[PDB]
Amino acid sequence: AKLHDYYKDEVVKKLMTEFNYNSVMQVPRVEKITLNMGVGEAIADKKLLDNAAADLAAISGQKPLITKARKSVAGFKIRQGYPIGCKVTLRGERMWEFFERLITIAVPRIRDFRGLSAKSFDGRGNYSMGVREQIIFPEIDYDKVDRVRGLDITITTTAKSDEEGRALLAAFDFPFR
Amino acid sequence: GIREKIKLVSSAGTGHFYTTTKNKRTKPEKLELKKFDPVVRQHVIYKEAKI
Amino acid sequence: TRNGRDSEAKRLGVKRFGGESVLAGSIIVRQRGTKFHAGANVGCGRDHTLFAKADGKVKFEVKGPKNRKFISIEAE
Amino acid sequence: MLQPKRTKFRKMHKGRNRGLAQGTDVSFGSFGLKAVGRGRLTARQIEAARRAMTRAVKRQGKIWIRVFPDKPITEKPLAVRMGKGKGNVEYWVALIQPGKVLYEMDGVPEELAREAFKLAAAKLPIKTTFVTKTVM
Amino acid sequence: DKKSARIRRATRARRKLQELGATRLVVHRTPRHIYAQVIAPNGSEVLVAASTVEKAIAEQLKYTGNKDAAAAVGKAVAERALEKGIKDVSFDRSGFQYHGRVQALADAAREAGLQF
Amino acid sequence: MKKDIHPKYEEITASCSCGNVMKIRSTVGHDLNLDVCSKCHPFFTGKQRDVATGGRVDRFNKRFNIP
RNA sequence: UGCCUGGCGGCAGUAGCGCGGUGGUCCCACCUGACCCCAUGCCGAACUCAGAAGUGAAACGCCGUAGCGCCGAUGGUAGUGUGGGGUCUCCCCAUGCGAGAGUAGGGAACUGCCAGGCAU
RNA sequence: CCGACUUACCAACCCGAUGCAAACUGCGAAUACCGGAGAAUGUUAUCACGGGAGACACACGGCGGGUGCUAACGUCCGUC
RNA sequence: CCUCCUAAAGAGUAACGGAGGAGCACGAAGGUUGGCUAAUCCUGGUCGGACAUCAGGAGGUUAGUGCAAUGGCAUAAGCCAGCUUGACUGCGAGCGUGACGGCGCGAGCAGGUGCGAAAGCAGGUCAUAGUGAUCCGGUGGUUCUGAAUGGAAGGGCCAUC
Ligand SMILES: [Mg+2]
Ligand SMILES: [Mg+2]
Ligand SMILES: [Mg+2]
Ligand SMILES: [Mg+2]
Ligand SMILES: [Mg+2]
Ligand SMILES: [Mg+2]
Ligand SMILES: [Mg+2]
Ligand SMILES: [Mg+2]
Ligand SMILES: [Mg+2]
Ligand SMILES: [Mg+2]
Ligand SMILES: [Mg+2]
Ligand SMILES: [Mg+2]
Ligand SMILES: [Mg+2]
Ligand SMILES: [Mg+2]
Ligand SMILES: [Mg+2]
Ligand SMILES: [Mg+2]
Ligand SMILES: [Mg+2]
Ligand SMILES: [Mg+2]
Ligand SMILES: [Mg+2]
Ligand SMILES: [Mg+2]
Ligand SMILES: [Mg+2]
Ligand SMILES: [Mg+2]
Ligand SMILES: [Mg+2]
Ligand SMILES: [Mg+2]
Ligand SMILES: [Mg+2]
Ligand SMILES: [Mg+2]
Ligand SMILES: [Mg+2]
Ligand SMILES: [Mg+2]
Ligand SMILES: [Mg+2]
Ligand SMILES: [Mg+2]
Ligand SMILES: [Mg+2]
Ligand SMILES: [Mg+2]
Ligand SMILES: [Mg+2]
Ligand SMILES: [Mg+2]
């Protein structure tokens, strides 16, 4: 809750002033975080996909869903229904917790940093972001690794405009370039 | 074409049987549905036998 | 040379028109799908045949938010 | 020649050609060549009339063709009997009813237009006349 | 959207009940309150009605939106109907999935009498 | 949250270089010794430069010292 | 009797959408918890329960406005039943029926039962 | 490694305008057909059952069409 | 044998007329209860590319339907789950379609089932193709018949090849 707490007094009240939100309800809050990691190399061997699953379960604290192709595509030689990736939605206590971790452990282990981008926003205000390796999280143990592997990390928000979001992020001292 | 014919036989020893079809390649499992035997006038087990 | 085929006609359509006096059972329409929908005292068969469920008179009407056509038996 | 790039079907019933036309106004250009009679216009007749009226303005102004031949016409080979299926497609036509503006011109003087359209009309199987825009 | 997703979820049963021409005991529940009414077969005429907004029922209750407010409404209506003239009835979830508060309302009405 | 399908998720302690210590919930299942927290980091702190370009003329006058 | 609001209908775009305002006493919504009843192919998001610190931001209801949708004459034209006729692949005359499109224009729905709150 | 200047030329979606369709339809007749009610008229003209058949090569003309060349005293259907 | 058109707005309607399909498949792809909503483009995002999986927006069925075409389909007949065998036996008011043989639809009765708290629903599948008379034989059943009589053989009847 650290940052849920921080959010509930420090963040809300700053943003409160700098936009002149009359209603408090108007203040952007963070809704949910979701961690995709597609694993096309599944159609080759299915063990790989489950091996991802444990990673994403080890990072995040909860079992991932296993996603399947919506339609068949011949481009990648897949057919509708084969498992090809896995996600976790994070919503509460756990969502704020992982977030805390992301900022204050994971992201300053990025092999050579320059912050993150502040360009990656959808236009409504939901921050999307990749990670090249998965050693970034100390949840995993680097000498017990099969492969280098990545994920998306998408922070879905109640922000209305692209801009208004950025503020919400920054106000948690989010490391933008 | 491929679906064979089979008879399902009452467990109530009456003799009475139904008939149906089956893909044996794909599902080779002696089919055991439960049907109404009218010689004893009660639902009982029926078990796949050969036509 | 590659043509020359056709199927046998199915005599579909309305058998009993608006105002006609019918007996319970009588077929009203034969159709493919529910071009007409069963209304009051009217059943719908497994080939979407509409039939009277009670002696009376046939009645068509348009009703509902989709402007569908319904058939009903007034029990006159 | 003008001809549908593709069609749902190869061959069409004969049909009839009753009625008056839709498209009786000069809509694009200033002058048009309207059809008084009734008949078929073949792709070839359209191309021949088009070339005639182009050449006699020396590529000044702009020509619209309002009609388009989208009806295929079949014929039986020589020395074959009746029956054994429908014939093979040979050429394409447009059905013309009285009133159908056929071509439109713009960007030349009226008296030049007159002489351009008079030539093209000699290439057509249907009686035509010259027409102008109307305010309404 | 919740209400749209709910209304849709109710409509099949709502329509079945029309054709059968049944007096229907129809529920409605929100965070704070639960309601009941019994509608004439035509679907346009209330006969008896009971809820946690009528002061007479509420003044007992510790809270107007729980499984005990339910039982209170699930009795008032059944009394007010059995004393009217209405024994046989059909229950109408109305989207809400027969459980908890909604089911509590219903069970109590089976105790009073209402024969569904 | 469903029962007995998810991994253990518990308190630990995460001691950086700069003495910085933070109780945190994680699977890892024992206390970490990490080396660069959000306080120990050039970028977060404000350190990293951007590589000094445009030295050629400074270089040359530093290197030779000639009239 | 008036004004609000919730539930169930009739009716099924003259009733829908957009654009602009506006409402929290009650109602409704978001909302606050989650060991429990119940729940998630992961997630109290949804469903479910126990509640009332907060806000009407969204949503929802209400009010206004013609940018759209929608409705739409009168007249004329097209067609066509019967009887005549021609220059008969297509038309014309007498009589009966008479569109579609488009034009003027309409239009920001109308209405029943029950309950609740306020005002008189 | 991107670029940058320039388009003598091609043009998707979208927007506005103009057409066409037996196998297109956000429209839609006249007639025809089904059912009900009422007069007048008609040597029951109607339906059922029983005795006896013949016929199952059709032709042209009008109207609506397929085929053919809107050829045929052609050919194939509907209707008088 | 099925679907569309020709076919002239009820049915039906020919040609060596114009176009396409069938000679199956499913113990779930059937029954019921509970729940759910498509295509496609745009924006952002590790490998990841025009196209895989994630998040948001626009969109509103332009998707989907075991297999043709047509008519249907949101209360979905489309998609996912739990439990299950109504892919029941006897019958059937009434009606549709045929020259006939036949084929089709069916509410309700009786017995015994499944799902649902219940109201209810279920006699296969969104519907329309997936088919072969009679004879002569086979298999199982049978309060029938049994050439002097008791049996039996053969015959009938019901189920099926
Ligand atoms: Mg047919
Ligand atoms: Mg049925
Ligand atoms: Mg015609
Ligand atoms: Mg025309
Ligand atoms: Mg909630
Ligand atoms: Mg109009
Ligand atoms: Mg008029
Ligand atoms: Mg009009
Ligand atoms: Mg409005
Ligand atoms: Mg009559
Ligand atoms: Mg009469
Ligand atoms: Mg003969
Ligand atoms: Mg003959
Ligand atoms: Mg002949
Ligand atoms: Mg003849
Ligand atoms: Mg003729
Ligand atoms: Mg002669
Ligand atoms: Mg002849
Ligand atoms: Mg017809
Ligand atoms: Mg006709
Ligand atoms: Mg004939
Ligand atoms: Mg034929
Ligand atoms: Mg199915
Ligand atoms: Mg269902
Ligand atoms: Mg992509
Ligand atoms: Mg989306
Ligand atoms: Mg489609
Ligand atoms: Mg189904
Ligand atoms: Mg009978
Ligand atoms: Mg039970
Ligand atoms: Mg089917
Ligand atoms: Mg023999
Ligand atoms: Mg004997
Ligand atoms: Mg003997």
Side-chain angles (χ1 to χ4, degrees), chain A residues 1-35 37-78 80-110 113 115-127 129-177, chain B residues 1-26 28-32 34-51, chain C, chain D residues 1-103 105-136, chain E residues 1-53 56-61 63-81 83-86 88-116, chain F residues 1-47 52-57 59-61 63-65 67:
Chain A
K2 261 291 299 304
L3 303 185
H4 190 31
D5 279 48
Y6 186 79
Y7 168 75
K8 210 177 290 175
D9 49 356
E10 306 313 278
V11 176
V12 64
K13 165 260 282 176
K14 184 201 301 183
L15 301 166
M16 203 76 184
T17 58
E18 76 106 297
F19 293 100
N20 292 308
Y21 297 129
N22 45 349
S23 56
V24 29
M25 276 295 144
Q26 224 154 348
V27 164
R29 66 199 135 289
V30 331
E31 181 190 298
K32 63 178 185 172
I33 295 175
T34 329
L35 321 178
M37 45 153 70
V39 189
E41 58 202 7
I43 54 156
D45 159 53
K46 296 294 179 183
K47 302 278 192 177
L48 300 181
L49 175 49
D50 74 51
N51 279 305
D55 295 342
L56 201 68
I59 287 182
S60 204
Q62 61 192 62
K63 191 160 87 71
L65 192 76
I66 287 149
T67 62
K68 310 193 304 308
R70 174 172 63 78
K71 60 188 196 264
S72 60
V73 282
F76 312 119
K77 301 146 45 57
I78 74 176
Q80 166 181 285
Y82 317 158
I84 50 155
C86 60
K87 75 169 180 184
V88 278
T89 293
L90 302 167
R91 275 184 189 281
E93 196 70 4
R94 295 217 171 192
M95 187 248 293
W96 281 117
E97 237 135 283
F98 159 82
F99 191 45
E100 190 273 10
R101 228 150 64 233
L102 187 66
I103 300 292
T104 74
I105 302 174
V107 111
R109 295 161 52 97
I110 284 173
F113 206 24
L116 308 169
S117 166
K119 283 288 156 64
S120 177
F121 279 104
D122 65 344
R124 311 303 308 263
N126 311 291
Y127 188 77
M129 150 187 182
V131 311
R132 256 148 279 294
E133 323 97 315
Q134 78 292 38
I135 52 154
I136 303 316
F137 299 92
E139 280 74 335
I140 84 158
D141 192 2
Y142 97 102
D143 71 350
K144 309 197 67 55
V145 168
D146 61 358
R147 306 171 57 119
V148 70
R149 205 186 273 122
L151 46 153
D152 313 305
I153 303 179
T154 301
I155 294 163
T156 294
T157 344
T158 56
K160 314 220 75 66
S161 74
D162 194 355
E163 178 295 312
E164 290 183 26
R166 193 198 320 290
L168 182 69
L169 286 305
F172 292 91
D173 185 356
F174 199 94
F176 291 142
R177 170 166 61 264
Chain B
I2 303 302
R3 294 176 74 78
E4 302 290 54
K5 291 198 294 291
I6 75 190
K7 53 166 64 178
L8 304 171
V9 191
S10 179
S11 297
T14 57
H16 184 274
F17 61 92
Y18 294 84
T19 50
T20 187
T21 63
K22 181 147 183 289
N23 195 158
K24 290 182 164 77
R25 291 88 143 293
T26 65
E29 291 62 60
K30 282 277 176 292
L31 200 194
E32 302 191 358
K34 163 190 295 193
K35 319 301 232 82
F36 177 82
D37 188 317
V39 182
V40 294
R41 288 176 69 226
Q42 301 150 57
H43 285 72
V44 298
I45 289 290
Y46 274 76
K47 222 207 75 67
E48 172 182 351
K50 302 170 187 157
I51 279 272
Chain C
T1 53
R2 254 178 59 201
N3 305 317
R5 289 178 307 287
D6 203 8
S7 64
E8 178 170 346
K10 299 294 165 195
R11 297 76 168 133
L12 307 186
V14 174
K15 305 307 175 184
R16 292 288 148 68
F17 293 88
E20 289 193 57
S21 301
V22 301
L23 298 163
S26 306
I27 288 165
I28 320 301
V29 261
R30 285 158 56 70
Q31 53 176 7
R32 293 305 178 236
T34 49
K35 186 168 167 289
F36 299 94
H37 293 262
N41 311 99
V42 169
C44 186
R46 60 166 299 288
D47 59 346
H48 312 280
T49 299
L50 274 43
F51 57 97
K53 261 163 71 191
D55 300 352
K57 285 180 191 165
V58 172
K59 166 89 173 306
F60 291 79
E61 48 264 292
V62 180
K63 62 167 196 68
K66 304 275 264 284
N67 302 107
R68 303 294 187 73
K69 288 166 283 166
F70 280 87
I71 303 174
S72 54
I73 306 298
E74 261 101 65
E76 295 282 319
Chain D
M1 293 179 294
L2 293 180
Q3 187 191 291
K5 292 177 184 68
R6 45 158 287 246
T7 43
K8 281 185 285 179
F9 300 111
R10 281 166 59 234
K11 300 173 198 174
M12 273 181 46
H13 285 345
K14 192 182 310 315
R16 295 290 174 288
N17 189 10
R18 302 180 60 202
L20 299 161
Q22 320 306 122
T24 58
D25 304 322
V26 182
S27 296
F28 300 67
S30 307
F31 316 108
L33 212 211
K34 156 169 294 199
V36 168
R38 182 195 301 290
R40 299 172 171 188
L41 253 54
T42 60
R44 285 187 140 63
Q45 283 160 181
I46 292 171
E47 177 63 355
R50 184 203 63 73
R51 289 166 181 172
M53 80 180 85
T54 282
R55 198 172 47 227
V57 296
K58 309 170 163 51
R59 308 182 184 170
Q60 307 310 116
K62 176 168 185 58
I63 317 292
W64 295 260
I65 317 174
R66 293 284 299 289
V67 298
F68 179 94
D70 58 305
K71 175 174 178 61
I73 298 295
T74 56
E75 292 192 60
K76 298 276 273 177
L78 199 78
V80 318
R81 296 199 199 286
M82 309 306 282
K84 327 295 174 184
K86 192 175 179 76
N88 302 304
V89 171
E90 288 311 309
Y91 64 89
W92 295 77
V93 306
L95 269 47
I96 309 308
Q97 307 69 32
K100 191 66 158 194
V101 162
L102 301 172
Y103 301 86
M105 278 191 83
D106 180 290
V108 325
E110 199 256 57
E111 265 34 57
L112 187 67
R114 290 257 175 182
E115 203 48 53
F117 278 155
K118 189 175 178 176
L119 296 175
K123 304 272 179 273
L124 295 174
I126 306 189
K127 214 93 168 291
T128 64
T129 195
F130 180 96
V131 291
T132 57
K133 277 211 294 302
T134 46
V135 184
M136 189 196 291
Chain E
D1 178 301
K2 279 158 73 145
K3 204 173 71 176
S4 72
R6 201 195 74 226
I7 288 293
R8 192 198 71 240
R9 208 176 311 113
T11 285
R12 191 173 207 83
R14 292 276 183 84
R15 295 290 175 289
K16 184 54 166 197
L17 272 159
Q18 265 220 83
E19 68 99 303
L20 300 153
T23 287
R24 58 176 173 114
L25 165 55
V26 40
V27 93
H28 184 259
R29 86 107 150 70
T30 67
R32 197 173 293 287
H33 292 277
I34 193 144
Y35 311 82
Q37 23 197 53
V38 181
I39 321 300
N42 63 48
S44 183
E45 230 161 352
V46 171
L47 309 178
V48 322
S51 50
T52 59
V53 290
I57 300 160
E59 97 309 14
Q60 263 54 248
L61 295 167
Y63 183 52
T64 58
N66 57 3
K67 291 173 218 135
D68 306 57
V73 171
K75 187 185 186 188
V77 92
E79 290 155 348
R80 291 181 190 181
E83 83 87 356
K84 183 86 86 154
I86 309 158
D88 272 284
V89 134
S90 296
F91 188 72
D92 175 2
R93 286 169 47 225
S94 320
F96 307 106
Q97 67 100 341
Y98 190 83
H99 187 83
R101 287 169 66 190
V102 142
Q103 172 170 12
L105 185 150
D107 280 302
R110 299 188 207 252
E111 295 329 292
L114 280 179
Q115 214 303 278
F116 64 79
Chain F
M1 184 165 281
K2 282 204 174 90
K3 281 192 178 301
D4 61 61
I5 62 155
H6 303 320
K8 282 80 184 173
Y9 183 82
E10 277 289 349
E11 176 171 1
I12 48 161
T13 317
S15 312
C16 186
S17 59
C18 61
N20 180 4
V21 142
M22 44 186 74
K23 323 303 176 192
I24 184 60
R25 312 219 302 136
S26 178
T27 63
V28 71
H30 69 273
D31 295 13
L32 299 173
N33 294 283
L34 76 135
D35 48 281
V36 48
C37 71
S38 52
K39 315 298 191 170
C40 320
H41 192 285
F43 185 94
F44 293 71
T45 54
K47 303 290 162 284
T53 189
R56 285 267 70 183
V57 179
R59 174 84 186 291
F60 179 80
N61 295 301
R63 216 198 301 161
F64 288 90
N65 306 359

